[PDB]
Amino acid sequence: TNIESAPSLAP
Amino acid sequence: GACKRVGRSDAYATEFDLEAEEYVPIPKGEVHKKKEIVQDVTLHDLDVANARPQGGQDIISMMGQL
């Protein structure tokens, strides 16, 4: 529901 | 049962801009390797190994003298 975006934690 | 730290993987090389750390590439081969090794010792190597603690067991040996 446009909550499909994803962040990251790798350097 | 031996193991060694080869380094830190260089995918982490930018955790910081400076750290006192040895960044190495990830191994490019198979993660597991099986090798046939024919190993030689002598009966004297057995003498030495059974007579006294050897190598990294005998840390106090660094003092010399007795």
GROMACS .gro file of C-alpha atoms in nm:
model
   77
    1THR     CA    1   0.000   0.000   0.000
    2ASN     CA    2   0.297   0.225  -0.084
    3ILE     CA    3   0.459   0.077   0.229
    4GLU     CA    4   0.680  -0.136   0.002
    5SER     CA    5   0.998   0.077   0.030
    6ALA     CA    6   1.310  -0.068   0.207
    7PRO     CA    7   1.624   0.082   0.373
    8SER     CA    8   1.968  -0.079   0.428
    9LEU     CA    9   2.229  -0.136   0.701
   10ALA     CA   10   2.536  -0.256   0.506
   11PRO     CA   11   2.833  -0.014   0.508
   12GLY     CA   12   4.022  -2.812   1.524
   13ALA     CA   13   4.257  -2.534   1.413
   14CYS     CA   14   4.123  -2.193   1.315
   15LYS     CA   15   4.262  -1.856   1.206
   16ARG     CA   16   4.124  -1.504   1.169
   17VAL     CA   17   4.229  -1.409   0.815
   18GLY     CA   18   4.095  -1.054   0.850
   19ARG     CA   19   3.779  -0.849   0.823
   20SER     CA   20   3.590  -0.869   0.495
   21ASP     CA   21   3.637  -0.555   0.285
   22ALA     CA   22   3.261  -0.523   0.237
   23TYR     CA   23   3.302  -0.365   0.583
   24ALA     CA   24   3.600  -0.153   0.477
   25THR     CA   25   3.391   0.167   0.513
   26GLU     CA   26   3.247   0.096   0.859
   27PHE     CA   27   3.471   0.393   0.947
   28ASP     CA   28   3.711   0.602   0.747
   29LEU     CA   29   4.001   0.497   0.971
   30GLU     CA   30   4.017   0.185   1.180
   31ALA     CA   31   4.319  -0.022   1.284
   32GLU     CA   32   4.193  -0.322   1.089
   33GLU     CA   33   4.311  -0.554   0.808
   34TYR     CA   34   4.039  -0.564   0.540
   35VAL     CA   35   4.057  -0.861   0.300
   36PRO     CA   36   3.834  -0.967   0.007
   37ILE     CA   37   3.571  -1.236   0.063
   38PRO     CA   38   3.696  -1.581  -0.047
   39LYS     CA   39   3.618  -1.628  -0.416
   40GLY     CA   40   3.623  -2.010  -0.410
   41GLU     CA   41   3.402  -2.272  -0.249
   42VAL     CA   42   3.341  -2.210   0.121
   43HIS     CA   43   3.432  -2.576   0.192
   44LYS     CA   44   3.733  -2.768   0.058
   45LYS     CA   45   3.830  -3.133   0.113
   46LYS     CA   46   4.197  -3.227   0.060
   47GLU     CA   47   4.393  -3.553   0.086
   48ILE     CA   48   4.725  -3.479   0.262
   49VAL     CA   49   4.991  -3.742   0.331
   50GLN     CA   50   5.161  -3.623   0.653
   51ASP     CA   51   5.506  -3.740   0.771
   52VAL     CA   52   5.647  -3.734   1.124
   53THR     CA   53   5.937  -3.915   1.290
   54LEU     CA   54   5.966  -4.104   1.617
   55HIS     CA   55   6.185  -3.817   1.736
   56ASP     CA   56   5.903  -3.568   1.676
   57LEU     CA   57   5.700  -3.793   1.906
   58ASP     CA   58   5.983  -3.795   2.162
   59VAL     CA   59   5.996  -3.415   2.165
   60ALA     CA   60   5.617  -3.372   2.176
   61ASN     CA   61   5.579  -3.614   2.468
   62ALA     CA   62   5.878  -3.495   2.673
   63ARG     CA   63   5.776  -3.129   2.719
   64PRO     CA   64   5.493  -2.885   2.640
   65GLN     CA   65   5.566  -2.744   2.295
   66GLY     CA   66   5.501  -2.422   2.106
   67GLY     CA   67   5.201  -2.214   2.211
   68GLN     CA   68   5.158  -2.433   2.517
   69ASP     CA   69   5.492  -2.320   2.660
   70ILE     CA   70   5.446  -1.944   2.672
   71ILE     CA   71   5.678  -1.890   2.972
   72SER     CA   72   5.962  -2.024   2.753
   73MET     CA   73   5.991  -1.666   2.619
   74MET     CA   74   6.182  -1.572   2.938
   75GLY     CA   75   6.485  -1.783   2.841
   76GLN     CA   76   6.737  -1.886   3.109
   77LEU     CA   77   6.585  -2.189   3.292
   0.00000   0.00000   0.00000
